[PDB]
């Protein structure tokens, strides 16, 4: 049974926040994985991208730990990436899943040409960088699928993008940097100021303001 500690957890459990997008709107940090499990528990899938043994040299021998990369996300609008290093592989995978759940970001999807049907590709050309690895997503026509390497393809399918062109530069052999770069490119999709978002924003009430009294008495 989940007993929330943060204010956001109490509001989410108490049936006050109705959607994860209300949390995304105010850029609130999510520190309890039970929030993600509560909002998208049914549709979430995980996929262990890589297990890498890292070694620290010591006076007698090499102390070996294991680093797990886990990509999570319902195949519609949401995706997350998590990296966890531990002494046991199973513990590392569990921690990486928790971290991937904590890192779920929304994905903005657009159209290539005509705006008929649901959005299917990235709104515009986006770029992510992580340590000499540059990943570029390009909008693609309907039905083209994902033209990318396997590692970015997993995350792109997991986010919900149906069609996408991809160009990668750098040392993509490092799976961690490749995954973090494509994750960064995905995350940038809702930070691009396109003309359709030029309309002046109407500010609403934050959950901490809307439910101040309920938090006071709970």
């Amino acid at each position: 049974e989940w007993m929330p500690v943060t204010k956001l957890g109490r509001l989410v459990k108490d049936m006050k926040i109705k959607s994860l997008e209300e949390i995304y709107l105010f850029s609130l940090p999510i520190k309890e994985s039970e929030i993600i499990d509560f909002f998208l528990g049914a549709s979430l899938k995980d996929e262990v991208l890589k297990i890498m043994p890292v070694q620290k040299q010591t006076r007698a021998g090499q102390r070996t730990r294991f680093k797990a990369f886990v990509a999570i996300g319902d195949y519609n609008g949401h995706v997350g990436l998590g990296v966890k290093c531990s002494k046991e592989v199973a513990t590392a995978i569990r921690g990486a899943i928790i971290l991937a759940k904590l890192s779920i970001v929304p994905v903005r999807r657009g159209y290539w040409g005509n705006k008929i049907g649901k959005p299917h590709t990235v709104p515009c050309k986006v770029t992510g960088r992580c340590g000499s690895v540059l990943v570029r997503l390009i909008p693609a026509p309907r039905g083209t699928g994902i033209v990318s390497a396997p590692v970015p393809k997993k995350l792109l399918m997991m986010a919900g993008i149906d069609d996408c062109y991809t160009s990668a530069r750098g040392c993509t052999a490092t799976l961690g940097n490749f995954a973090k770069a494509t994750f960064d490119a995905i995350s940038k999709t809702y930070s691009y100021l396109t003309p359709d978002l030029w309309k002046e924003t109407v500010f609403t009430k934050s959950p901490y303001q809307e439910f101040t009294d309920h938090l006071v008495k709970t």
Binding site: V48, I51, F66, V89
Partner: peptide, 25 residues
């Protein structure tokens, strides 16, 4: 398989490490 994780953790750098890592993912 838990047996795969065990056989990998016994020898993280060995004759069978690559196969067990591929199995884990």
């Amino acid at each position: 398989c838990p047996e795969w994780m065990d056989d990998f953790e016994a020898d993280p750098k060995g004759k069978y490490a690559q196969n067990l890592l591929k199995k884990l993912i």
